[PDB]
Amino acid sequence: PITRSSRAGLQFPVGRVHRLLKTRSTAHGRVGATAAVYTAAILEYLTAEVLELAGNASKDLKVKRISPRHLQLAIRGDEELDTLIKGTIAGGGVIPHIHKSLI
């Protein structure tokens, strides 16, 4: 048996995503396999982007583990991820910034 993920060269599960799409479909719709492959590929891409930025931010501070603070810094430092992710991160804090006229 060969998994669909190894067939498409992915790390994320294709069968699980296909099952979730089928569960969430409306009024006896249908879902193809290429849809699941596409969705898994995009999820993997977004995860890799966020994790790469977070790991670089972590290495900037000379630590070996990622915490919510590093995720907050990585997301708020990137414009595309800032637009995409509008949510609140628990324990993330804010980006240090002070206005010029207050100094």
Binding site: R69, T88, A90, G91, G93, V94, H97, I98, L102
Partner: protein
Amino acid sequence: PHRYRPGTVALREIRKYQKSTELLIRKLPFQRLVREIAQDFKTDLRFQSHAVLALQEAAEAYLVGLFEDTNLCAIHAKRVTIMPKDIQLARRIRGE
């Protein structure tokens, strides 16, 4: 004696609290206030601890963002002190 000019310790606190990530309001008063508010919608409610924690985090984030907007509104009018009218203007433009 040794004293500091007004605004120096304020800047130190600004730099200190922008670097940490902990909660800033005490937990027991917030829990009591939440219970009192919820008393008006249903009688004899019970609360899970994580629910109160989530409420506190959301409220603190909301207040910090509103204060950033208020600071912008205060700077626009050539001031450094924030006033209730700045909060009112920010909340009006936000659509609240």
